[PDB]
Amino acid sequence: PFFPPLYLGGPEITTENCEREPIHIPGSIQPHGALLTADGHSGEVLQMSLNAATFLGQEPTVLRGQTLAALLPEQWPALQAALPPGCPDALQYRATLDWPAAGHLSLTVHRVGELLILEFEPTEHALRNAMSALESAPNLRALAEVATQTVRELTGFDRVMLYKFAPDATGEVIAEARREGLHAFLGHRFPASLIPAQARALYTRHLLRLTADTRAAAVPLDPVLNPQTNAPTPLGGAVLRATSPMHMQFLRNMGVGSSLSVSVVVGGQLWGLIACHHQTPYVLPPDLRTTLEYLGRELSEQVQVKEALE
Ligand SMILES: *C/C=C1/C(=C/c2[nH]c(/C=C3[NH+]=C(/C=C4\NC(=O)C(C=C)=C4C)C(C)=C\3CCC(=O)O)c(CCC(=O)O)c2C)NC(=O)[C@H]1C
């Protein structure tokens, strides 16, 4: 059973209670983007990340309580049609915005209950070839190797691993692609506690997460609770959600400035992760994340196929 989050008087997490951290409701985001929440009927803006006004070039007083009809006149009708009440929470509306103050932005929206969650961040054949390369891989080891090399080629990440969960939830690096000079993790195994049970559960439902800068302080949502419910805003489906500080510290101690993983899901179970590191902070472009999501699904399919052959 989850502890209350920090903003509802819950404890700071320690190694005795890793599994009790409510990582899905941190009430805060990473500073490389901005987040709004809005009422799913009216489009009234209900919450904003503290950086949202500055990030979007709006007056703080003007942004709170404004409507999406007024803020996003060109997207609001399409957004409503795309995300009706009761639609799957995983369903997304995506648009590219020409925003003079911030530049070209990627807008990603999903619905949870009666709330729309809007994520804004900057945005800037390969997919076909990568997809084909995974399919054409001859066995599981080769598939793992191709997956890591292909993801590294697409992303530029310093390290890309295939991290496989054992039945006891320990993990092992079973393939990696790595920059010259980096220590090998191939064949190394790690305790189950380093990716705790609630993280593993979340990663079965929401298939990509990241920390763009492992030193960056989280930016709170204001108000922190959804005014509709007087309860935490669900952020499991928001890539911008703040990462657990316990994990951020783990990464800093490894010399990792930026981290990203994609779930590999086989028979509805979390089989492993495509796990990526960069030494320097690094925001993987939105279009590249979409490509990785496609490759995660392809790898998942191919792991099942390869495991059936062998
Ligand atoms: C006492 C609790 C601790 C803890 C909790 C924790 N860890 C995560 C997320 C991840 N941990 C990962 C572990 C590894 N990455 C590696 O590269 C290696 C070894 C080579 C390991 C063992 C990974 C891959 C994740 C996924 C996230 C990512 O890809 O960056 C969470 C949940 C984080 C979040 O989503 O907010 C939590 C709560 N970690 C510990 O080390 C102990 C101290």
GROMACS .gro file of C-alpha atoms and ligand atoms in nm:
model
  353
    1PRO     CA    1   0.000   0.000   0.000
    2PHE     CA    2   0.134   0.340  -0.119
    3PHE     CA    3   0.249   0.614   0.117
    4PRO     CA    4   0.082   0.950   0.069
    5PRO     CA    5   0.279   1.171  -0.169
    6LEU     CA    6   0.512   1.436  -0.021
    7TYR     CA    7   0.257   1.718  -0.069
    8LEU     CA    8  -0.005   1.520   0.131
    9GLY     CA    9   0.232   1.487   0.429
   10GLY     CA   10   0.388   1.156   0.325
   11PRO     CA   11   0.743   1.060   0.423
   12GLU     CA   12   1.055   1.104   0.219
   13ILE     CA   13   1.133   0.763   0.074
   14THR     CA   14   1.420   0.551   0.206
   15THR     CA   15   1.560   0.208   0.117
   16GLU     CA   16   1.325   0.047   0.374
   17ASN     CA   17   1.015   0.154   0.177
   18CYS     CA   18   1.116   0.195  -0.191
   19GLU     CA   19   0.807   0.003  -0.302
   20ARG     CA   20   0.566   0.240  -0.124
   21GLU     CA   21   0.663   0.555  -0.320
   22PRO     CA   22   0.357   0.676  -0.520
   23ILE     CA   23   0.567   0.746  -0.832
   24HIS     CA   24   0.261   0.799  -1.053
   25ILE     CA   25   0.147   1.112  -0.860
   26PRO     CA   26   0.455   1.327  -0.792
   27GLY     CA   27   0.259   1.655  -0.838
   28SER     CA   28   0.552   1.787  -1.040
   29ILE     CA   29   0.727   1.767  -1.378
   30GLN     CA   30   1.068   1.786  -1.545
   31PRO     CA   31   1.169   2.139  -1.648
   32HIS     CA   32   1.240   2.069  -2.019
   33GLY     CA   33   0.865   2.094  -2.092
   34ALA     CA   34   0.548   2.245  -1.948
   35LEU     CA   35   0.226   2.076  -1.832
   36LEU     CA   36  -0.132   2.200  -1.805
   37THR     CA   37  -0.437   2.013  -1.689
   38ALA     CA   38  -0.780   2.120  -1.810
   39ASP     CA   39  -1.143   2.032  -1.753
   40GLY     CA   40  -1.248   1.776  -2.015
   41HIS     CA   41  -1.581   1.949  -2.089
   42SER     CA   42  -1.515   2.324  -2.052
   43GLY     CA   43  -1.144   2.329  -2.136
   44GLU     CA   44  -1.079   2.553  -1.831
   45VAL     CA   45  -0.712   2.534  -1.731
   46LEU     CA   46  -0.714   2.384  -1.380
   47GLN     CA   47  -0.344   2.326  -1.304
   48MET     CA   48  -0.016   2.452  -1.446
   49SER     CA   49   0.346   2.360  -1.387
   50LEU     CA   50   0.521   2.659  -1.216
   51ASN     CA   51   0.730   2.707  -1.533
   52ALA     CA   52   0.434   2.698  -1.775
   53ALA     CA   53   0.377   3.075  -1.802
   54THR     CA   54   0.748   3.145  -1.868
   55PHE     CA   55   0.780   2.839  -2.097
   56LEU     CA   56   0.473   2.939  -2.306
   57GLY     CA   57   0.533   3.319  -2.285
   58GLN     CA   58   0.202   3.387  -2.106
   59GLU     CA   59   0.131   3.613  -1.808
   60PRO     CA   60   0.090   3.386  -1.497
   61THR     CA   61  -0.240   3.559  -1.408
   62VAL     CA   62  -0.376   3.511  -1.765
   63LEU     CA   63  -0.291   3.137  -1.789
   64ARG     CA   64  -0.472   3.005  -1.476
   65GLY     CA   65  -0.846   2.972  -1.550
   66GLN     CA   66  -0.808   3.049  -1.924
   67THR     CA   67  -0.983   2.808  -2.161
   68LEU     CA   68  -0.828   2.581  -2.425
   69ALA     CA   69  -1.074   2.738  -2.674
   70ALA     CA   70  -0.889   3.069  -2.620
   71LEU     CA   71  -0.537   2.930  -2.565
   72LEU     CA   72  -0.544   2.673  -2.849
   73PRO     CA   73  -0.819   2.784  -3.094
   74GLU     CA   74  -0.680   2.571  -3.383
   75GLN     CA   75  -0.655   2.246  -3.177
   76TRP     CA   76  -0.942   2.257  -2.923
   77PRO     CA   77  -1.218   2.119  -3.152
   78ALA     CA   78  -0.993   1.836  -3.279
   79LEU     CA   79  -0.875   1.767  -2.922
   80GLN     CA   80  -1.235   1.728  -2.792
   81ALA     CA   81  -1.332   1.498  -3.077
   82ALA     CA   82  -1.019   1.285  -3.031
   83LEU     CA   83  -1.049   1.239  -2.653
   84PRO     CA   84  -1.417   1.195  -2.549
   85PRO     CA   85  -1.528   1.095  -2.195
   86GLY     CA   86  -1.449   0.732  -2.107
   87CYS     CA   87  -1.189   0.684  -2.385
   88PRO     CA   88  -0.884   0.469  -2.298
   89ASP     CA   89  -0.632   0.662  -2.084
   90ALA     CA   90  -0.352   0.544  -2.320
   91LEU     CA   91  -0.523   0.717  -2.619
   92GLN     CA   92  -0.334   1.030  -2.733
   93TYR     CA   93  -0.401   1.347  -2.928
   94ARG     CA   94  -0.081   1.493  -3.076
   95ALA     CA   95  -0.023   1.825  -3.255
   96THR     CA   96   0.271   2.040  -3.363
   97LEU     CA   97   0.235   2.409  -3.267
   98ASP     CA   98   0.412   2.717  -3.408
   99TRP     CA   99   0.457   2.910  -3.081
  100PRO     CA  100   0.658   3.234  -3.131
  101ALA     CA  101   0.783   3.260  -2.769
  102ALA     CA  102   0.891   2.891  -2.746
  103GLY     CA  103   0.938   2.787  -3.114
  104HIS     CA  104   0.792   2.471  -3.270
  105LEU     CA  105   0.628   2.271  -2.987
  106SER     CA  106   0.500   1.916  -2.961
  107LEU     CA  107   0.164   1.898  -2.782
  108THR     CA  108   0.064   1.561  -2.637
  109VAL     CA  109  -0.274   1.520  -2.467
  110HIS     CA  110  -0.450   1.234  -2.292
  111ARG     CA  111  -0.761   1.202  -2.077
  112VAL     CA  112  -0.781   1.056  -1.728
  113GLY     CA  113  -1.138   1.059  -1.600
  114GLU     CA  114  -1.274   1.410  -1.655
  115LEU     CA  115  -0.925   1.570  -1.681
  116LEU     CA  116  -0.718   1.647  -1.991
  117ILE     CA  117  -0.341   1.639  -1.935
  118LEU     CA  118  -0.148   1.856  -2.185
  119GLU     CA  119   0.230   1.824  -2.230
  120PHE     CA  120   0.427   2.084  -2.424
  121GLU     CA  121   0.791   2.048  -2.525
  122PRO     CA  122   1.020   2.171  -2.801
  123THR     CA  123   1.031   1.971  -3.122
  124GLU     CA  124   1.282   1.972  -3.406
  125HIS     CA  125   1.264   0.555  -4.373
  126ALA     CA  126   1.481   0.508  -4.061
  127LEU     CA  127   1.184   0.359  -3.873
  128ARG     CA  128   1.106   0.125  -4.166
  129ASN     CA  129   1.467   0.000  -4.179
  130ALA     CA  130   1.492  -0.040  -3.800
  131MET     CA  131   1.163  -0.233  -3.790
  132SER     CA  132   1.290  -0.459  -4.071
  133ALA     CA  133   1.627  -0.511  -3.896
  134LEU     CA  134   1.453  -0.643  -3.582
  135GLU     CA  135   1.227  -0.878  -3.785
  136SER     CA  136   1.524  -1.008  -3.987
  137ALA     CA  137   1.736  -1.084  -3.676
  138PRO     CA  138   1.798  -1.465  -3.672
  139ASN     CA  139   1.783  -1.551  -3.299
  140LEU     CA  140   1.721  -1.396  -2.954
  141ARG     CA  141   2.081  -1.292  -2.885
  142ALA     CA  142   2.113  -1.137  -3.231
  143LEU     CA  143   1.774  -0.965  -3.185
  144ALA     CA  144   1.894  -0.820  -2.855
  145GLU     CA  145   2.216  -0.699  -3.019
  146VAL     CA  146   2.039  -0.547  -3.322
  147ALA     CA  147   1.784  -0.381  -3.091
  148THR     CA  148   2.056  -0.215  -2.881
  149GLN     CA  149   2.268  -0.109  -3.181
  150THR     CA  150   1.968   0.020  -3.377
  151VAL     CA  151   1.829   0.220  -3.084
  152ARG     CA  152   2.177   0.364  -3.021
  153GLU     CA  153   2.211   0.464  -3.392
  154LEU     CA  154   1.869   0.637  -3.388
  155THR     CA  155   1.913   0.819  -3.055
  156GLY     CA  156   2.284   0.885  -3.013
  157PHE     CA  157   2.265   0.762  -2.652
  158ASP     CA  158   2.604   0.678  -2.491
  159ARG     CA  159   2.471   0.339  -2.374
  160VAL     CA  160   2.174   0.126  -2.477
  161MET     CA  161   2.108  -0.202  -2.292
  162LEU     CA  162   1.854  -0.480  -2.310
  163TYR     CA  163   1.772  -0.541  -1.943
  164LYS     CA  164   1.589  -0.872  -1.886
  165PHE     CA  165   1.383  -0.952  -1.574
  166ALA     CA  166   1.425  -1.296  -1.418
  167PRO     CA  167   1.127  -1.464  -1.249
  168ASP     CA  168   1.245  -1.328  -0.909
  169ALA     CA  169   1.248  -0.975  -1.061
  170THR     CA  170   1.628  -0.944  -1.057
  171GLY     CA  171   1.760  -0.795  -1.379
  172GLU     CA  172   2.045  -0.874  -1.613
  173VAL     CA  173   2.204  -0.681  -1.898
  174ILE     CA  174   2.185  -0.936  -2.186
  175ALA     CA  175   2.302  -0.704  -2.468
  176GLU     CA  176   2.448  -0.357  -2.488
  177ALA     CA  177   2.578  -0.100  -2.733
  178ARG     CA  178   2.815   0.150  -2.572
  179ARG     CA  179   3.039   0.448  -2.646
  180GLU     CA  180   3.422   0.396  -2.644
  181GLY     CA  181   3.558   0.399  -2.287
  182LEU     CA  182   3.239   0.305  -2.099
  183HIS     CA  183   3.257   0.010  -1.857
  184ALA     CA  184   3.082  -0.311  -1.978
  185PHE     CA  185   2.761  -0.409  -1.797
  186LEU     CA  186   2.700  -0.717  -2.017
  187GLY     CA  187   2.621  -1.019  -1.798
  188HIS     CA  188   2.593  -0.815  -1.480
  189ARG     CA  189   2.289  -0.884  -1.259
  190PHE     CA  190   2.109  -0.646  -1.023
  191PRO     CA  191   1.872  -0.683  -0.726
  192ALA     CA  192   1.495  -0.664  -0.783
  193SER     CA  193   1.474  -0.365  -0.548
  194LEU     CA  194   1.648  -0.132  -0.796
  195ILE     CA  195   1.332  -0.133  -1.011
  196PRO     CA  196   1.071  -0.179  -0.741
  197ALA     CA  197   0.739  -0.357  -0.778
  198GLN     CA  198   0.522  -0.047  -0.826
  199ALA     CA  199   0.760   0.077  -1.098
  200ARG     CA  200   0.743  -0.259  -1.272
  201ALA     CA  201   0.362  -0.249  -1.250
  202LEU     CA  202   0.347   0.106  -1.389
  203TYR     CA  203   0.584   0.003  -1.670
  204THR     CA  204   0.342  -0.269  -1.780
  205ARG     CA  205   0.076   0.005  -1.849
  206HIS     CA  206   0.286   0.308  -1.953
  207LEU     CA  207   0.560   0.190  -2.181
  208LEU     CA  208   0.815   0.476  -2.193
  209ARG     CA  209   0.967   0.696  -1.926
  210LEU     CA  210   1.272   0.917  -1.894
  211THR     CA  211   1.480   1.160  -1.692
  212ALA     CA  212   1.631   1.423  -1.923
  213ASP     CA  213   1.856   1.579  -1.657
  214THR     CA  214   1.930   1.380  -1.344
  215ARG     CA  215   2.034   1.696  -1.152
  216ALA     CA  216   1.722   1.902  -1.241
  217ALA     CA  217   1.482   1.985  -0.961
  218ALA     CA  218   1.118   1.895  -1.020
  219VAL     CA  219   0.876   2.178  -1.107
  220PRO     CA  220   0.552   2.154  -0.902
  221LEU     CA  221   0.200   2.168  -1.042
  222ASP     CA  222  -0.009   2.454  -0.904
  223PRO     CA  223  -0.251   2.386  -0.753
  224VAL     CA  224  -0.094   2.052  -0.671
  225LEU     CA  225  -0.428   1.867  -0.646
  226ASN     CA  226  -0.683   1.842  -0.924
  227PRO     CA  227  -0.960   2.087  -0.818
  228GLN     CA  228  -1.221   1.856  -0.974
  229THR     CA  229  -1.147   1.586  -0.716
  230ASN     CA  230  -0.934   1.745  -0.442
  231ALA     CA  231  -0.706   1.451  -0.511
  232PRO     CA  232  -0.371   1.386  -0.680
  233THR     CA  233  -0.340   1.433  -1.057
  234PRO     CA  234  -0.259   1.098  -1.224
  235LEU     CA  235   0.069   1.143  -1.413
  236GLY     CA  236   0.164   0.784  -1.496
  237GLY     CA  237   0.088   0.859  -1.863
  238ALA     CA  238   0.280   1.188  -1.871
  239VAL     CA  239   0.637   1.153  -1.999
  240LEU     CA  240   0.712   1.489  -1.833
  241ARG     CA  241   0.627   1.360  -1.484
  242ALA     CA  242   0.901   1.395  -1.224
  243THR     CA  243   1.116   1.086  -1.164
  244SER     CA  244   1.158   0.930  -0.818
  245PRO     CA  245   1.443   1.106  -0.633
  246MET     CA  246   1.575   0.763  -0.526
  247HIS     CA  247   1.623   0.669  -0.890
  248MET     CA  248   1.764   1.012  -0.983
  249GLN     CA  249   2.032   0.962  -0.714
  250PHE     CA  250   2.111   0.609  -0.839
  251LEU     CA  251   2.167   0.760  -1.185
  252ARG     CA  252   2.386   1.046  -1.065
  253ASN     CA  253   2.604   0.797  -0.875
  254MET     CA  254   2.648   0.602  -1.202
  255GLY     CA  255   2.756   0.918  -1.386
  256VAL     CA  256   2.432   0.924  -1.586
  257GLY     CA  257   2.297   1.268  -1.681
  258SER     CA  258   2.003   1.141  -1.889
  259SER     CA  259   1.809   0.812  -1.879
  260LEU     CA  260   1.526   0.663  -2.089
  261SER     CA  261   1.364   0.322  -2.105
  262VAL     CA  262   1.105   0.143  -2.312
  263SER     CA  263   0.913  -0.156  -2.183
  264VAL     CA  264   0.934  -0.493  -2.354
  265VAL     CA  265   0.599  -0.661  -2.282
  266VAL     CA  266   0.551  -1.030  -2.371
  267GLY     CA  267   0.224  -1.212  -2.292
  268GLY     CA  268   0.108  -0.910  -2.088
  269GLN     CA  269   0.411  -0.939  -1.855
  270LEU     CA  270   0.709  -0.703  -1.824
  271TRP     CA  271   0.984  -0.906  -1.990
  272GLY     CA  272   1.252  -0.637  -1.981
  273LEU     CA  273   1.354  -0.285  -2.078
  274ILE     CA  274   1.540  -0.115  -2.356
  275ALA     CA  275   1.741   0.097  -2.108
  276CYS     CA  276   1.936   0.402  -2.230
  277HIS     CA  277   2.193   0.631  -2.069
  278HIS     CA  278   2.373   0.953  -2.160
  279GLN     CA  279   2.653   1.107  -1.954
  280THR     CA  280   2.543   1.464  -2.038
  281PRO     CA  281   2.180   1.576  -1.988
  282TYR     CA  282   1.991   1.518  -2.311
  283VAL     CA  283   1.634   1.565  -2.430
  284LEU     CA  284   1.555   1.300  -2.686
  285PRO     CA  285   1.336   1.474  -2.951
  286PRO     CA  286   0.959   1.388  -2.941
  287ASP     CA  287   0.961   1.231  -3.290
  288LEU     CA  288   1.249   1.003  -3.187
  289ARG     CA  289   1.054   0.890  -2.876
  290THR     CA  290   0.762   0.789  -3.100
  291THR     CA  291   1.005   0.586  -3.312
  292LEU     CA  292   1.132   0.413  -2.995
  293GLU     CA  293   0.771   0.336  -2.891
  294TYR     CA  294   0.718   0.162  -3.228
  295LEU     CA  295   1.046  -0.030  -3.188
  296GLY     CA  296   0.953  -0.132  -2.833
  297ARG     CA  297   0.633  -0.289  -2.967
  298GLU     CA  298   0.824  -0.457  -3.253
  299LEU     CA  299   1.092  -0.591  -3.015
  300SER     CA  300   0.818  -0.724  -2.785
  301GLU     CA  301   0.659  -0.909  -3.079
  302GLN     CA  302   0.996  -1.041  -3.198
  303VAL     CA  303   1.102  -1.161  -2.851
  304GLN     CA  304   0.786  -1.373  -2.843
  305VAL     CA  305   0.860  -1.501  -3.199
  306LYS     CA  306   1.229  -1.577  -3.127
  307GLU     CA  307   1.148  -1.747  -2.794
  308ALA     CA  308   0.897  -1.972  -2.979
  309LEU     CA  309   1.163  -2.070  -3.237
  310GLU     CA  310   1.426  -2.157  -2.973
  311LIG     C1  311   1.515   0.214  -0.261
  311LIG     C2  312   1.476   0.234  -0.406
  311LIG     C3  313   1.561   0.240  -0.510
  311LIG     C4  314   1.522   0.263  -0.651
  311LIG     C5  315   1.398   0.288  -0.696
  311LIG     C6  316   1.348   0.315  -0.832
  311LIG     N1  317   1.403   0.288  -0.949
  311LIG     C7  318   1.328   0.326  -1.050
  311LIG     C8  319   1.350   0.317  -1.196
  311LIG     C9  320   1.458   0.244  -1.269
  311LIG     N2  321   1.567   0.186  -1.217
  311LIG    C10  322   1.640   0.132  -1.316
  311LIG    C11  323   1.765   0.055  -1.289
  311LIG    C12  324   1.875   0.040  -1.363
  311LIG     N3  325   1.914   0.111  -1.469
  311LIG    C13  326   2.033   0.065  -1.509
  311LIG     O1  327   2.095   0.111  -1.604
  311LIG    C14  328   2.075  -0.048  -1.425
  311LIG    C15  329   2.196  -0.131  -1.434
  311LIG    C16  330   2.281  -0.127  -1.537
  311LIG    C17  331   1.977  -0.062  -1.334
  311LIG    C18  332   1.968  -0.162  -1.223
  311LIG    C19  333   1.577   0.155  -1.438
  311LIG    C20  334   1.623   0.108  -1.577
  311LIG    C21  335   1.461   0.228  -1.408
  311LIG    C22  336   1.362   0.274  -1.514
  311LIG    C23  337   1.367   0.427  -1.540
  311LIG    C24  338   1.472   0.466  -1.641
  311LIG     O2  339   1.478   0.398  -1.746
  311LIG     O3  340   1.548   0.565  -1.620
  311LIG    C25  341   1.217   0.382  -1.001
  311LIG    C26  342   1.103   0.446  -1.074
  311LIG    C27  343   1.155   0.574  -1.146
  311LIG    C28  344   1.046   0.652  -1.212
  311LIG     O4  345   0.994   0.605  -1.316
  311LIG     O5  346   1.010   0.762  -1.160
  311LIG    C29  347   1.231   0.375  -0.857
  311LIG    C30  348   1.131   0.427  -0.757
  311LIG     N4  349   1.635   0.257  -0.725
  311LIG    C31  350   1.740   0.217  -0.652
  311LIG     O6  351   1.854   0.204  -0.695
  311LIG    C32  352   1.703   0.191  -0.508
  311LIG    C33  353   1.795   0.276  -0.418
   0.00000   0.00000   0.00000
